[PDB]
């Protein structure tokens, strides 16, 4: 299972000028490009070592896409303001994502495309990639053009053909880095949270991809922190449990990662 | 590559 997802954000700024528009591209959990209009280069640029040789044609095209997407979204911000009957003074957000997925084999598994107004679903491309789901009274008016247009067609064409063609090309271009599995470095901490009480934290560090299952089992209500970025391609997570004074050894930590031969089991050493 | 065409709401 591999993915080529992008994540577009547009934010209106009635005070300032043109809405702020940002694009980010991800092959699996690795970002590889980004566009930001309110930046030194109003242009798409590399964000991964293996994209740094792609040459002007690629960047000139992918810039035209981002800039054009921003101009349309400039209109969409103002359109949806009219639809919902909101004042020019208020600032609003418009988010667009799209991604294709490769299966067990190297073939197209699934594709998805959604946009959300103000952090809530607006219009959704359905499983069948031919019909849209409108969240709202307003989204139906939008949908009416998207249906009548057959955007479905154009977006299906991207998701099924071009998205997977280019996902493949990226997987090969960055094969040295992307196609490698780094397993987690796992250890178990202890801190006497009083005398009678005691905490037991299971660490998993330096693992790609970010998919992981840390579970505390006894021979049971465990504290989790959202998997965080290490800030060097890799990720880290910890799970904790508050356990009786002594009797830490009854509690064992189970770490499941794609890059481990078999799920690893831990206990508190000292 | 990003989607060459987007929705006009």
């Amino acid at each position: 299972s591999h993915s080529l997802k992008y994540f577009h954000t547009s934010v209106s700024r009635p005070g300032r000028g043109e809405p702020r528009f940002i694009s980010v591209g991800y092959v699996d959990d690795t970002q590889f490009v980004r566009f930001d209009n309110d930046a030194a280069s109003p242009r798409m640029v590399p964000r991964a070592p293996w994209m740094e040789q792609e040459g002007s044609e690629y960047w000139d095209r992918e810039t035209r896409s981002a800039r054009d997407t921003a101009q349309i979204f400039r209109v969409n911000l103002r359109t949806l303001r009219g639809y919902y009957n909101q004042s020019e003074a208020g600032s609003h957000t418009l988010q667009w994502m799209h991604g294709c997925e490769l299966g067990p084999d190297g073939r197209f598994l699934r594709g998805y495309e959604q946009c959300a107004y103000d952090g809530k679903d607006y219009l959704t491309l359905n499983e069948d990639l031919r019909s849209w789901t409108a969240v709202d009274t307003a989204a139906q008016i939008s949908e009416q053009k998207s249906n009548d247009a057959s955007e479905a067609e154009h977006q299906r064409a991207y998701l099924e053909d071009t998205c997977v063609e280019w996902l493949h090309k990226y997987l090969e271009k960055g094969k040295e880095t992307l196609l490698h599995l780094e397993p987690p470095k796992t250890h178990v901490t202890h801190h006497p949270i009083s005398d009678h009480e005691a905490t037991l934290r299971c660490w998993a560090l330096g693992f790609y991809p970010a998919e992981i299952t840390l579970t505390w089992q006894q021979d049971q209500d465990t504290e989790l922190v959202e998997t965080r970025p290490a800030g060097d391609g890799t990720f880290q997570k910890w799970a904790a449990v508050v356990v009786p004074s002594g009797e830490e050894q009854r509690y064992t930590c189970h770490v499941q990662h794609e890059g481990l031969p078999e799920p690893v089991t831990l206990r508190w050493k000292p | 590559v990003m989607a060459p065409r987007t929705l006009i709401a």
Partner: T-cell receptor, first 110, second 112 residues
Framework: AKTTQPPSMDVAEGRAANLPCNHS???????VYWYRQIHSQGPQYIIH???NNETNEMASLIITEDRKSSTLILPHATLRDTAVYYC????????????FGQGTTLQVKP | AGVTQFPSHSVIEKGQTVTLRCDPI?????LYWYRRVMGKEIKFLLH????????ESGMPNNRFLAERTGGTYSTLKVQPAELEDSGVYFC??????????FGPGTRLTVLE
């Protein structure tokens, strides 16, 4: 380049007109569009497609398996169908501007 | 149905100011300007998505100015008009951006 057609073609009215078009250098997100111009009035959309065959009220578009060649079929040519026939590739974009080649000038012989 | 353009014809002296109008098929968010100078084929000028310009890439120079502020009908002002401008100016509207509906065209002749 991008699309090459005959400069001009003749068809006795009633019988089908098969307008060929060449585009070896096409990609997978480049659609094949057909427009025409009856004397110097507004261009008129006929039909378009990507890879598979498509028919509509006016004409049928036949794209080759290799997608390098295309043929527009006017099933029974009429004196109205006398016009310049433009074969245009449009890469999926947010503008989809038309680039007009020389085009095939079709004389429907009465 | 149909896109409407005005005027049907224009004949002016080099230096003079002409303005072309186009009314798109009611509802169509997308409005386009194309043109055919004498000799050359039809070429793309400009693409509007409502009141907002989306693609100017075909607009020749500073003398040509196009506006669709009231995101419905569109103006195109040549100021000052020059000999080389002489050609047919075709407006179009779409809605889906796949089928472009063209108007009858404004026919412009700038004369020494």
């Amino acid at each position: 380049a991008k699309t090459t057609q005959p400069p001009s073609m003749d068809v006795a009215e009633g019988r089908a007109a098969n307008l060929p078009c060449n585009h070896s250098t096409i990609s997978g997100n480049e659609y094949v569009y057909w427009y025409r111009q009856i004397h110097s009035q507004g261009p008129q959309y006929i039909i378009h497609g990507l890879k598979n065959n498509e028919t509509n009220e006016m004409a049928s578009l036949i794209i080759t398996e290799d997608r390098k060649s295309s043929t527009l079929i006017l099933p029974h040519a009429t004196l109205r169908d006398t016009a310049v026939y433009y074969c245009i590739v449009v890469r999926s974009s947010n503008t989809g501007k038309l680039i007009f080649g020389q085009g095939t000038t079709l004389q429907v012989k009465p | 149905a149909g896109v409407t353009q005005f005027p049907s014809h224009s004949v002016i002296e080099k230096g003079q100011t002409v303005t072309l109008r186009c009314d798109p098929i009611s509802g169509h968010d997308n409005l386009y300007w194309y043109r055919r100078v004498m000799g050359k084929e039809i070429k793309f000028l400009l693409h509007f998505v409502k009141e907002s310009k989306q693609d100017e890439s075909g607009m020749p120079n500073n003398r040509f100015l196009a506006e669709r502020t009231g995101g419905t009908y569109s103006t195109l002002k040549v100021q000052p008009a020059e000999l080389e401008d002489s050609g047919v100016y075709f407006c179009a509207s779409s809605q889906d951006r796949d089928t472009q509906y063209f108007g009858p065209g404004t026919r412009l002749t700038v004369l020494e």
